[PDB]
Amino acid sequence: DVQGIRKAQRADGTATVMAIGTAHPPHIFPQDTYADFYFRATNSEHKVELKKKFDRICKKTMIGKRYFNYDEEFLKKYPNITSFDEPSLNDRQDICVPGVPALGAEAAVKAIAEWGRPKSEITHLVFCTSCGVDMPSADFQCAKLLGLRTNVNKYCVYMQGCYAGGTVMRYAKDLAENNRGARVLVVCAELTIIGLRGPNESHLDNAIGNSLFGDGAAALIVGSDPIIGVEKPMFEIVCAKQTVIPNSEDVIHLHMREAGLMFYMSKDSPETISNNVEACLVDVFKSVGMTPPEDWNSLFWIPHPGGRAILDQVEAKLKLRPEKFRATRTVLWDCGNMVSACVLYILDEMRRKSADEGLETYGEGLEWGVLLGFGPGMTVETILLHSLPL
Template sequence: MPAYIQNISTVVPERSYDQTFLRDRMKEYISNKDITQRIIHRIYSNSGINKRHTVIPDFNANGDPRFFFQENGTLNVPSTGARNELYTQKAKELFVETARQTIEETPSVNRDDITHVITVSCTGFFAPEPAFEIIQKLGLPTSTQRYHLGFMGCFAAFPAMKMAKSFCESHPNAKVLIVCLELCSIHLQPSESTDNLISASVFADGAAGLIITKDKPHETNSYELTNFATAIAQESEKDMAWTIGDTGFDMVLSTYVPDIIKANLKQSIAPLLTDYQLTIDDIKHWALHPGGRAILDKVQDNFNIANEQLSPSRQVLANYGNMSSATILFVLKELLNRPSSEAQESVLAMAFGPGLTIESGLLQKIQPT
């Protein structure tokens, strides 16, 4: 039984900063060592990012208390508790707003129709979990089933979509709401290590929602979820990971990650292509998680992907940075909104996360009939 993404909605915090501004503030606050400042300048200038959104109130004109970058030139290092308190406050608001917008932008689904809510986040925790907040604030049926995927990182939208597809296959009337939300910026670390500086240069805040049902939309573009695959790159566990410390989550994004992904790509997507007797040339669109510019460059080089095929990923990276689990949904939305030359076009979607795990999905972009 097929399942379809009816709509994808995206929400970001109102506050955003240019990448050049953030580069200069990091040089100002992190270290006065010439070598470190040169590294920061190079990383930020070559990131492929123009701006990023954040819930952090620093540098605005409202006079809000600063969280990290103090006016006296020092860098505050909040505790994990303080960071999670900010996460709880801001995430509750954004989860509800994203869910509301997703439902309102899906004409074929009403609030009372939602049977399952799957929430995804790896940047903070609170209980009752986010789906409870969504159900309470939006007045969804109290019988709505709730699920939460946590601490899976940038690839977590894929397990959520697989869960939703299974629910639709098991329950023909299922209408599944997924909301992925990440507030990565609250975990900035005052570290001069290259891996931490790379993490600080790409991660940002944002949320995305989608509704999956068995019904094929007839008025708007949609995606049919065809099949998924999962692969783990061996001996790469420490190159993309994070731990919970006393001063937030310590995220590691090794400089080796792009090469590890490149070395494991072909074998990771082979099952999808084999099952449907496809070749790389049969893929019309590529929806790649833009974990960083170097990752996109390596994938493009590995498969000889045309610039136009990768432009949705590069555009999302430039305008939003890496929002962890929500980012691939921004890419899929960007692609969904673009004109199609055919009634049905193949899409290969991929995301990369801790493990190092490579999640991929074969989708069909369908025009309304």
């Protein structure tokens, strides 16, 4: 009986985040001296007017510090990486191919420890990075490092950029919900040395990238039908939808070249996202038969902090009070833009605080919330969350 098999195979309830772990590489770079370091490490101190421009840009980021897997001494071994576009992909791959699954595994071990169940109960691995590619891929390496079962179903989410924190939640939803007993380990890990490069005055946008991106890894356990008393259900992934904004392909794009990953951006990302986010929010509510709230302040919020300008304009467009993006701005200050890992860090910050503040739910005491990823396309990932009692 094929239908009986299907009925027994699938889960009952909504996919639920039940653990979150994070990990950083060891080297801390304060933002207030980053321009000094960067123009020194790229041998560009003669570009004095460029250097002030970059210092002023760094002061506007609302990033306090970032973590990296390299220090100034390390980079001296790679003059090709600190140039603008000398051949360098091979060296970057030699670092990122083993390094990204290793950092991801550090976050995964912490998520598994919080979860408190044996790693042998992990049935699915969703691994996400925009930093390096290889065959067998980074999911294979992470599973090996962690000792997962040999028949774990793996999903390698490569080169999905800054919306991919939303992407992995979308994957984990269907994996957890369609498979009885499934426990999905989600790992996002980024080592931005894949794209680090020297400044070039004809590509000021490529340079601003070096003011934003930092390293980091985050991991979740997602599953349906939590074991009550044992597992800790925090956020239910009710609806997950990806949207492309037409006529915005030139706003953000990144290309894998002989000089590594080359980042490009127009100035239009704040307005493109803010002019389109409302439609994405209505879509995700209407897709589960719900009416969107009249006041967007009724929800809790995990927007991806792609830039402080993006946050400010989305905040204005949605008429949100200044405290609503508190958790997001805290992670941005503490960590910079860790690409896919950010929104998972922010989910962690929000639920930890909500417990510290003894609130009614993990979502700042509110019932419903939205997690948003933004990135190349332009692409929006919109995740409708229902948070649970604390």
